[PDB]
Amino acid sequence: WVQPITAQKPSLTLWLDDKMFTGLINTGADVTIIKLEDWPPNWPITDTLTNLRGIGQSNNPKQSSKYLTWRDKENNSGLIKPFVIPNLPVNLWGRDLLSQMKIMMASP
Amino acid sequence: WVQPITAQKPSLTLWLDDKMFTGLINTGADVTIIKLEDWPPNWPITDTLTNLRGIGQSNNPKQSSKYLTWRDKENNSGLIKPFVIPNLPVNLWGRDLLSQMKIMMASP
């Protein structure tokens, strides 16, 4: 597939394990982040000692306890372990996931 | 040109008016951000009403008073008015710029 970069949010819909999620393609993010409001309550999360840095800093965010199987509409698949954070406006697909989808950036 | 998305920071080097800048390709934001430490002191900046939403924290940036001519290594060009913020580790190329370079994302 091909998706131009425009003023609109570049979006991607995938399954993580058995649930469908929509998120923002964010080449600026090292890691993938799922909104706490979207996180299934029965999916375990765990403490981390890491720090998410950008505009400010979020210390020791929670993270999925288990690796999740991501799957796209073409049945490509792999594994990801997203962080899970409240008060996020959109889920964020980071380069840990995007690198597994073999995405290129190109210009005409 | 073509650049794969990997775990490494996707970077782009270009000119803004007469000065060369290197930055991170950031599809997650529709605006471009230049670090204050890299901003030429003689280039005017102004207060804005924009709020950049961060990781559980919002920063109020300055913005370039003037539009700047961007130019890449292939001599494509256009105009952007980036924001200017301190304490950011890298310059961030947003979709306002990326869309003028007509960058596509593609997968096999």
């Binding site: 923002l24 964010n26 080449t27 600026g28 993010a29 090292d30 890691v31 982040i33 890491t50 720090n51 998410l52 840095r53 950008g54 505009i55 996020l88 406006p89 959109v90 964020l92 980071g94 | 920071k9 991170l24 390709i25 950031n26 997650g28 934001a29 529709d30 605006v31 951000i33 924009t50 950049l52 939403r53 961060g54 990781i55 580790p89 890298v90 961030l92 947003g94």
Partner: peptide
């Protein structure tokens, strides 16, 4: 890790 969705 670094996370750049500001606007």
């Amino acid at each position: 890790p670094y996370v750049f969705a500001m606007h």
